[PDB]
Design goal:
binds 5,6,7,8-tetrahydrobiopterin; Nitric Oxide Synthase,Heme Domain, Chain A, domain 2; 12% strand; 4-stranded mixed β-sheet; alpha+beta; binds zinc ion; homodimer; Bovine Endothelial Nitric Oxide Synthase Heme Domain, Chain: A,domain 3; binds protoporphyrin IX containing FE; binds the ligand CNCc1cc(OCc2ccc3ccc(N)nc3c2)ccc1Cl
Chain lengths: 407, 411
């Protein structure tokens, strides 16, 4: 019941006590593990608030203090009165940072406490949302010196007044299906790229068209907004050895800013909370260029390299896949844009792990997502046993707006 | 209760109904997932239900469920349990359990071949020499001059646990590893402990970087004995690279037969503590794990040095670059000597087909994603985007404590 994890490369053993403060469920049972599955009222609300405020006041060395119990009462009362409650600013920040801290699938959590939190809870319209988002993008980009950020729109009320950013990331390239059969732009975004046009977006029908923002305030019909191009830092992709690479016409954007998750604090639900950090190299090169259901340029790169694409056993995909990721990292670093390689990130995470076990008694971690999609076993996370469980505050998935929105 | 796994690359959804036949525990709960953790004497009391379960399965598969043959066999097994406290498996039954133990191995990416497994019944074996003999014939048959064949040799089942047969080796064929006084390691670092054991058991170690370890065989719970596999039975492949001519000069070679010999085979409540089995290598086992892992031969750097890589910052991906070349070489050498091998793209492609087939014809295929995904180039193999369900089915291959930790020394 006080669980142990072993690193099989270093023999190091940590003891996880933090898991006993877990609350939500995993999907697994004693009969069947689901680790590889991608997606598994007033009386409900107060125990949740107490749990949060209890952990909040503990973290500031004021557990069971006057201030603590005061607030606990203050919140208890407001719930009885208003059927919800509002977070103090200090609690908001704490909640945000800890949702990142508890994000078991995020390899990048070593930075967790450095989160810049933008309180956008006064926002009332899509135009308002657009402004807050532009400000978030500008601050995070910082001319290439990326800083982590989250902007938080009003919490859910009765579920009919949901704030939502429909885009999955603030910045992503359009994908359009083609007359011949294939796909131009970015296949992952094809459906959304449609929904945008269905809302009256005029697509330049290019390969790298920055998608418009589709913002929904107070449960209203969502509106389209174009991010000022001067706020979208892009990197042209070239290889440091191969000069034909540039002719592939590749670039990628500097700012990964996930916008579709729900942020849960003290039982309050923030359905619009776009957050951002910086890219790990493989995210763009392994996943975004080379996945079959994506840019799938592997073929082309290997052809330009004149590799024996005849049998799998030449490992030409592997060879190509490496060069591509070499280029991505090369390009970003050349343009002074923050990026991290998978070796650096995973090492950083193993250190963050030792820290968390040491000063918190554990660190929920999801090995299926922490191990990079290339060169897995030569990164330190591979031989690292991990324990996965759900702590609060948390980022949760939520249904896509176009499947819910009452028009 | 039905469960759906989706494939996120192809949107193909499958439905698992087989997980309901699962009995054993996973280690997971609703509050904690342990899917990334590596590790998890029996009385007549629990034996017959375990036996009945198995025999039911068997007779179902041969389409004789409820038959007189089935009922008599249950009765027959029953009486033998109440009289002898255990029971013997018919040969048909032994073969079935063997194949299914493999078939149920949720970590095995190579299960597409499961029904084609040569089962050698060593249940008449009584001594270590007897074991050496059976094992030698296994290696010879399985190797087959390089055209590898799956096989397993099953030694006497456990009785009171005081008379176990065990192969003390983790695989039948493995290179020695020697710790040096300067803290460096000569040979395969994976095997240092086992090497010391052998040496202490009287093994004259040549102390080279590729010495094939002796077998250490225990029969009937007696102290284990050393035997040397005849070199002519040990097929080895010198590793060269198809474009880099300096790669041969690294002096590397690897053996062709992966034969794991330290697992326990469970069938019908019976426990076969010595059941060495073998198939053929997936390139990445040797090329990523066996050479490049930091706690193995660690030639990663030396290969990168000779490729004149920018080994200063990791951002050059020199490690990844050297890794791929080392796997290219491994596949190249094995194909060049006509020794059976499979690359990780081929293996995972086949597993996906196997898996899909299993869902249709069997209603599921237990699979451990953490182990099925290859140790390099993960997301460019089809398994990466395949959701999987992991659960435990018997017959099964189980882990078991190293015999040196649990053995009682006669002397
Ligand atoms: C600063 C550098 C950061 C890096 C390098 C990083 C890296 C990653 C990576 C590689 C993944 C796997 C995602 C995939 O492969 O699709 C991930 C997931 C995730 N990241 Fe981080 N991240 C960073 C910052 C942040 C920040 C600022 C937040 C939130 C405040 C965050 C929260 C999350 C969450 C919640 C997930 C998983 C979402 C899910 O469950 O699907 N990360 N991250
Ligand atoms: C014939 C070609 C085969 C291939 C290509 C293959 C491939 C693999 C690979 C790559 C692993 C990963 C192990 C690791 O990386 O540590 C594995 C695991 C495993 N294989 Fe197979 N295998 C084959 C045959 C067999 C046979 C003949 C058996 C049994 C009769 C078997 C049973 C198992 C079991 C039980 C595991 C899990 C190891 C564990 O639980 O620790 N495989 N297989
Ligand atoms: C629908 N599947 C859920 C899903 C969520 C995902 O979230 C990815 C994610 C989330 C936050 C990030 C923060 C920084 C960063 N560099 N990457 C980040 C990546 C990614 C893939 C999938 Cl498949
Ligand atoms: C306790 N760790 C379990 C473990 C099992 C292992 O078994 C590997 C294994 C087992 C069966 C195999 C069958 C065929 C094959 N080519 N490789 C095979 C490889 C290897 C490493 C570890 Cl760490
Ligand atoms: C901690 C971790 O689960 C462990 O090192 C596993 C990870 N996945 C693996 N997968 C395979 N195929 N072989 C292995 O040895 C391992 N090691
Ligand atoms: C099927 C599998 O669970 C799914 O593809 C996961 C695997 N691991 C992943 N890991 C990361 N970091 N990102 C991903 O999108 C995925 N996809
Ligand atoms: Zn699990």
């Amino acid at each position: 019941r006080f669980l142990k994890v072993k690193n099989w490369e270093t023999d190091v053993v940590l003891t996880d006590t933090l898991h006993l403060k877990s609350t939500l469920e995993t999907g697994c049972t004693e009969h069947i593990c689901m680790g590889s599955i991608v997606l598994p009222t007033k009386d409900q609300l107060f125990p949740l608030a107490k749990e949060f405020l209890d952990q909040y006041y503990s973290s500031i060395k004021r557990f069971g203090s006057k201030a603590h119990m005061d607030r606990l009462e203050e919140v208890n009362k407001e719930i009885e009165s208003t059927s919800t409650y509002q977070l103090k600013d200090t609690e908001l920040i704490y909640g945000a940072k800890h949702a990142w801290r508890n994000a078991s699938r995020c390899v990048g959590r070593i930075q967790w406490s450095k989160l810049q939190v933008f309180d956008a809870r006064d926002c009332t319209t899509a135009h308002g949302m657009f402004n807050y988002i532009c400000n978030h993008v500008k601050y995070a980009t910082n001319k290439g010196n990326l800083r982590s950020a989250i902007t938080i729109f009003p919490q859910r009320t009765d579920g009919k007044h949901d704030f939502r950013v429909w885009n999955s990331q603030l910045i992503r390239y359009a994908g359009y299906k083609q007359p011949d059969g294939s796909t131009l732009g970015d296949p992952a975004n094809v459906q959304f790229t449609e929904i945008c046009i269905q809302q009256g977006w005029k697509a330049p029908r290019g390969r790298f068209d920055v998608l418009p923002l589709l913002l929904q305030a107070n449960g209203n019909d969502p509106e389209l907004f174009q991010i000022p191009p001067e706020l979208v830092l892009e990197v042209p992709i070239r290889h440091p050895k191969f000069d034909w690479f540039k002719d592939l016409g590749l670039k990628w954007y500097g700012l990964p800013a996930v916008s579709n998750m729900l942020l849960e604090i003290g039982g309050l639900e923030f359905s619009a909370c776009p957050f951002s950090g910086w890219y790990m190299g493989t995210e763009i090169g392994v996943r975004n260029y080379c996945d079959n259901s994506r840019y799938n340029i592997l073929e082309e790169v290997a052809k330009k390299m004149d590799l024996d694409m005849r049998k799998t056993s030449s490992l030409w995909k592997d060879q190509a896949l490496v060069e591509i990721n070499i280029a991505v990292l090369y390009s970003f670093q050349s343009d002074k844009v923050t990026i991290v390689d998978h070796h650096s990130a995973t090492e950083s995470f193993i250190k963050h792990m030792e820290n968390e076990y040491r000063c918190r008694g554990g660190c929920p971690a999801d090995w299926v997502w922490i191990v990079p999609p290339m060169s897995g076993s030569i990164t330190p996370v591979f031989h690292q046993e991990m324990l996965n469980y759900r702590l609060t505050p948390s980022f949760e998935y939520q249904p896509d707006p176009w499947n819910t929105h009452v028009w």
